[PDB]
Amino acid sequence: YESEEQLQHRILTAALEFVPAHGWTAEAIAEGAQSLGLSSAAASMFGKDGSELILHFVTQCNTRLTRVLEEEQKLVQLGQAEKRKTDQFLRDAVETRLRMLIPYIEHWPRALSILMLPHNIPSSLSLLTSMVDDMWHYAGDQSTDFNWYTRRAMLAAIYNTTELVMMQDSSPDFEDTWRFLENRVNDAMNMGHTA
Numbered sequence: 001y002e003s004e005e006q007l008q009h010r011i012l013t014a015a016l017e018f019v020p021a022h023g024w025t026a027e028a029i030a031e032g033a034q035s036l037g038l039s040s041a042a043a044s045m046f047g048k049d050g051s052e053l054i055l056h057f058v059t060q061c062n063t064r065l066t067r068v069l070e071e072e073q074k075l076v077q078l079g080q081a082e083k084r085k086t087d088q089f090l091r092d093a094v095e096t097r098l099r100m101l102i103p104y105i106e107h108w109p110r111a112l113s114i115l116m117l118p119h120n121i122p123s124s125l126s127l128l129t130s131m132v133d134d135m136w137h138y139a140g141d142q143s144t145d146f147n148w149y150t151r152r153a154m155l156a157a158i159y160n161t162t163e164l165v166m167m168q169d170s171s172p173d174f175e176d177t178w179r180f181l182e183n184r185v186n187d188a189m190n191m192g193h194t195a
């Protein structure tokens with residue numbers, strides 16, 4: 001027994017395994033359904049342009065991030081890890097989140113162009129905003145903050161800038177991307193005295 005919303009969630013999760021081979025397409029969705037033992041006809045629950053699969057992927061990545069940040073916070077509470085200052089915390093959080101893209105990196109510029117279509121932009125912006133909100137919550141944010149916008153605008157700019165750099169990066173294990181991110185974070189957290 002399971003609801004329709006749950007059923008569609010499970011199919012789209014399974015479809016992700018096939019995006020590397022087939023792109024953000026109905027074909028990936030149909031392979032996902034079949035990999036679960038359902039009919040390929042279950043792809044007909046979804047559109048053809050890939051928007052639902054991509055938005056599903058972004059949401060899932062944001063959920064995985066919060067679970068990672070929760071786990072890391074628990075290590076801190078048990079005395080197994082140091083509490084990181086904000087610059088290192090943010091660098092690690094953005095890296096954790098962007099690494100989730102590595103298996104899909106050849107397809108990620110295409111996904112970004114689809115997330116920017118007019119009918120997707122409100123949802124893509126909500127998801128970005130929720131992501132940076134979450135990151136700041138675990139970085140130690142207070143419920144009430146006069147710097148609410150500045151913090152989120154800055155962190156969104158670091159994230160998106162680094163994402164663009166990563167789509168050009170051929171260095172081993174994206175070395176050059178994480179060095180860029182480190183510099184962007186260090187400069188944003190100490191903007192008054194940057195080079």
Ligand SMILES: CC(C)=CCC/C(C)=C/CC/C(C)=C/CO
Binds near residue numbers: 058116
């Ligand atoms: C603020 C503008 C103009 C674009 C950002 C919206 C966008 C392209 C989001 C892509 C997906 C993303 C970065 C998700 C993070 O949760």
Ligand SMILES: CC(C)=CCC/C(C)=C/CC/C(C)=C\CO
Binds near residue numbers: 116161
């Ligand atoms: C690759 C495509 C089609 C779009 C790039 C995604 C965006 C919106 C990048 C701009 C984000 C940025 C560099 C800073 C925050 O606005």
Ligand SMILES: CC(C)=CCC/C(C)=C/CO
Binds near residue numbers: 125126129
């Ligand atoms: C774009 C901003 C600042 C917030 C997301 C818009 C919104 C309230 C969506 C409801 O799901």
